[PDB]
From a paper:
Here we determine the diversity, potency, breadth and structural insights of bNAbs derived from memory B cells of BNT162b2-vaccinee after homogeneous Omicron BA.1 breakthrough infection. The top eight bNAbs neutralize wildtype and BA.1 potently but display divergent IgH/IgL sequences and neuralization profiles against other variants of concern (VOCs). Structural analysis consistently revealed diverse modes of bNAb action due to their distinct binding footprints on viral RBD or spike proteins.
The structures revealed that both antibodies interacted with RBM residues mostly outside the ACE2-binding site (left). RBD binding of P1D9 involved CDR L1, CDR L3, CDR H2 and CDR H3, with its footprint shifted upward on the RBD backside compared to P2D9, which used CDR L3, CDR H2 and CDR H3 (left). The binding residues of P1D9 included T28, I29 and N30 in CDR L1, Q90, Y92, S93 and N94 in CDR L3, I51, K56 and H58 in CDR H2, as well as W98, T99 and L100 in CDR H3, interacting with RBD residues including T345, N343, T345, R346, Y351, D442, S443, K444, G446, N448 and Y449. For example, significantly reduced neutralization was found for P1D9 against Gamma, Delta and Omicron BA.4/5, and for P2B4 against Beta, Gamma and Omicron BA.4/5. The L452R mutation in Delta and BA.4/5 or the L452Q mutation in BA.2.12.1 contributed to significant P1D9 resistance by forming a potential steric clash.
Author numbering:
A (entry chain L): 1 to 211
B (entry chain A): 335 to 381, 392 to 515
Write the structure that this text describes.
């Protein structure tokens, strides 16, 4: 089996708000629907059971409800902490089921990244390879943009980004972009620059160095 | 205006030994999708104040035991009805739901008990029985068994050993 469709898939809302998550079902259930909260870096947490049951450890700012095939977790007085992925569940008479997920990001005022560039360590160059790591720190929204320019030509093939999960404290993100060349390719260019475009920036931002 | 529907369409039923009871007060009943509904192995009625919907799952050939003055594992040790009983026992086969390869472990019954159950009594304790002589002090094996047991409902089972969902209206 009995499939469950949670929606919306992503939800961005500011502190103190009231959010409402839905879960349409292939068929019907009763004291057998239950909601879960997976915070990042963390196992799942049961929030509501037997449809509307308050649970234990969870506060009364969380509340569930539903009939037949449509069910609804709602949080009120949204808090930074609350951001996570939320999951439906159904129970038995053949078959167990959750849903896709629903990610709840916590909207806030735009914060521009603090960019920081690290050139390759001597240790690494000895071992054959060069890595230049650009670091965008504490920003919102996610939706940022990094480019590597090398002797001013836009490099494409050989970088990889990694953004962190939203941070409960300041509801920001951080991100690394990492350009990896072989030592031999690395020595065929002089200037290495990291250009950035966030909504929080008036004009783009570069941090660059020389080999 | 009365519910029933919440009782009948219940996604999963109780184990017989912890049989579930929903209270029904303030209203009259329509009927229809009871009685005029077929798909019931049984629809037996015997013999208002206030009405009790008592739901649970048993085997096929235990259903005869959900009647006044009946005996056996269920009537004795899991769900007793009074002789007095004015009410309805409604049952239906649910193999397509409550049976699993392995043996759906969700349905249990009380195997052994010191005495019989009173009408409409429900015992949920799991203190080990003590069949022999020795004091058990919580363990089991040599005599001294554990009191509940699984129906282990599997698709291949004959009807005699298949899951039947039983609703017991009582007046
Ligand atoms: C069961 O029946 C009740 C009452 O007729 C109805 O409101 C409900 O939607 C039905 N289904 C479930 C899963 O409760």
């Amino acid at each position: 089996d009995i499939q469950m469709t949670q929606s919306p898939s992503s939800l961005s809302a500011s502190v103190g708000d009231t959010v409402t998550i839905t879960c349409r079902a292939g068929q019907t259930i009763n004291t057998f629907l239950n909601w879960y909260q997976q915070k990042p870096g963390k196992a799942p947490k049961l929030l509501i059971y037997a449809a509307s049951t308050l649970q234990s450890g969870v506060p009364s700012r969380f509340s569930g409800s539903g009939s037949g095939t449509d069910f609804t977790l709602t949080i009120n007085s949204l808090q930074p902490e609350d951001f996570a992925t939320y999951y439906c569940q159904q129970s038995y008479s053949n078959l167990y089921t959750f849903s896709q997920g629903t990610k709840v990001e916590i909207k806030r005022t735009v914060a521009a990244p603090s960019v920081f560039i690290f050139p390759p360590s001597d240790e690494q160059l000895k071992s054959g390879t060069a890595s230049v790591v650009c670091l965008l720190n504490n920003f919102y929204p996610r939706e940022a943009k990094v480019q590597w320019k090398v002797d001013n030509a836009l490099q494409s093939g050989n970088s990889q980004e990694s953004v962190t999960e939203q941070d409960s404290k300041d509801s920001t993100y951080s991100l690394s972009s990492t350009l990896t060349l072989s030592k031999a390719d690395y020595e065929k260019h002089k200037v290495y620059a990291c250009e950035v475009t966030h909504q929080g920036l008036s004009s783009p931002v570069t941090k660059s160095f020389n080999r | 205006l009365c519910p029933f529907g919440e009782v009948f369409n219940a996604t999963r039923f109780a184990s017989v030994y912890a049989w579930n009871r929903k209270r029904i007060s303030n209203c009259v009943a329509d009927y229809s999708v009871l009685y005029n509904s077929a798909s019931f192995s049984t629809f037996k009625c015997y013999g208002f104040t206030n009405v009790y919907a008592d739901s649970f799952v048993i085997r096929g050939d235990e259903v005869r035991q959900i009647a006044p003055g009946q005996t056996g594992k269920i009537a004795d040790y899991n769900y007793k009805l009074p002789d007095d009983f004015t009410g309805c026992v409604i049952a239906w086969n649910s193999n397509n739901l409550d049976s699993k390869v392995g043996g759906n472990y969700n349905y249990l019954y009380r195997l052994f008990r010191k005495s019989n159950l009173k009408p409409f009594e429900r015992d949920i304790s799991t203190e080990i029985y003590q069949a022999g002589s020795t004091p058990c002090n919580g363990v089991e094996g040599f005599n001294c068994y554990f009191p509940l047991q699984s129906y282990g409902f599997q698709p291949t089972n004959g009807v005699g050993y298949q899951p039947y969902r039983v609703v017991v209206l009582s007046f």
